[PDB]
Design a protein around this ligand. Sequence first.
Ligand SMILES: [Fe+3]
Length: 191
Amino acid sequence: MSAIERITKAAHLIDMNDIIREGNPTLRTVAEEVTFPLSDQEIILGEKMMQFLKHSQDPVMAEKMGLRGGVGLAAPQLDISKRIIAVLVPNYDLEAIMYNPKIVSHSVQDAALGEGEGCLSVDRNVPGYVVRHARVTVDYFDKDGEKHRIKLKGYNSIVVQHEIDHINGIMFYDRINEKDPFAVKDGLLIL
Ligand SMILES: [Fe+3]
């Protein structure tokens, strides 16, 4: 059966085995927008994704399930090519399951996490500053089809852009400067 059918079973607990890794084509394909109303499966998927982030952040649960801590997850990482992402940033400073998220405005200023970025789908390290917009205005729909328009900055902005990149088939290392990975370009804010 399809990944979505499998993952949305009531009994299913997403774990690292459901997360596809580099090389799997799905991570480089642009995800299909979801239509409204959402199917029960699409709603359940978003919930399963958020439960996974919560489990990955619980020391006891993370150890038992063999999970890597994460603050974001995109459906393509589960081999589901739908524009659905989940973000969970503990202070939670940000908690959202977003359907068809889209950046509708961004700052001229860029930003990058000082400590760089990792990815549950990447088993290895690619050091460097992952250059992103410092600030973004994001439109997304929640499970009931209601539209939300939020403004993000700092770490939250980074996390959300990172997940939106997945639904567009972009990986974090694609935004690190090949030549000099730690170059601090003009207008780049290091967090
Ligand atoms: Fe990722």
